[PDB]
Structure formats: structure tokens, C-alpha cells
């Protein structure tokens, strides 16, 4: 009767796009592990070495998305990033954190 995901999103990747932006991408959890329709994703992130070290979350990302751009980040700062799935009932577990750093370089 579990109706929440028992597994995290898969193949989590993070790429720095510019001085304040990171593109986070993922794959849904294995279908059998979902225990219901996944209705949203959320992406949490936390600076390792920044001025703001609080955990932030982008919540309510639609189920069809396989990537999201985190914006407004600190320059030259490293972040832990975790993605999690949710059913209508509640949240699933987060992925194992991926570490990504913003930098001066811009991907054109």
C-alpha cells in the first residue's frame, strides 16, 4: 500500500552554464519503484563554500521535465545538488548529491 517512490531519480548530472547558473538533469526512477504516478520533481541545493550555506529547494517541477536550470547562484561557488521525485501522496528519497561549481567561464 506504499504510494510514494522508494527510489531516487537516476543519472543525475549537473553542468555549470555560467557564472550563476547550473543545469541539472535526471531520469525518472525505475517505474516499479514509483508506487504511483510521479507528479513532480524537486531539486535541492546547498553551497559548500559560499556566503549562503542554507539548503534551497526548487519545488513543483512538472513530471515531464528531465532538466532544470538553477539560477541566481553565487559565483565561484561549489554546490551539492540532490533531485527527488514525488507522487500525489508524498516525496520519495533524494538522489546521492552531485557536486558542481559555478565559475567565470560561460558556455556559449
Curated annotation (Swiss-Prot):
* Annotated spans, Disordered: 92-104
The residue ranges of the Fibronectin type-III domain are 8-104
UniProt subcellular location: Membrane
Q: How does it assemble?
A: Interacts with GRIP1. Interacts with PPFIA1, PPFIA2 and PPFIA3. Interacts with INSR.
Disorder: Aplasia or hypoplasia of the breasts and/or nipples 2: A group of congenital deformities encompassing total absence of breasts and nipple (amastia), absence of the nipple (athelia), and absence of the mammary gland (amazia).
| Homology family | Belongs to the protein-tyrosine phosphatase family. Receptor class 2A subfamily.
Question: What is the stated purpose of this protein?
Answer: Possible cell adhesion receptor. It possesses an intrinsic protein tyrosine phosphatase activity (PTPase) and dephosphorylates EPHA2 regulating its activity. The first PTPase domain has enzymatic activity, while the second one seems to affect the substrate specificity of the first one.
- Protein name stated in the entry: Receptor-type tyrosine-protein phosphatase F
Amino acid at each position: 500500500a506504499q504510494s510514494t517512490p522508494s527510489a531516487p531519480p537516476q543519472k543525475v548530472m549537473c553542468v555549470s552554464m555560467g557564472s550563476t547558473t547550473v543545469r541539472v538533469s535526471w531520469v525518472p526512477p525505475p517505474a516499479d519503484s514509483r508506487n504511483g504516478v510521479i507528479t513532480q520533481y524537486s531539486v535541492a541545493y546547498e553551497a559548500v563554500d559560499g556566503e549562503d550555506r542554507g539548503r534551497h529547494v526548487v519545488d513543483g517541477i512538472s513530471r515531464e521535465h528531465s532538466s532544470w536550470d538553477l539560477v541566481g547562484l553565487e559565483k565561484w561557488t561549489e554546490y551539492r545538488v540532490w533531485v527527488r521525485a514525488h507522487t500525489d501522496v508524498g516525496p520519495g528519497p533524494e538522489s546521492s548529491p552531485v557536486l558542481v561549481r559555478t565559475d567565470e567561464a560561460e558556455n556559449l
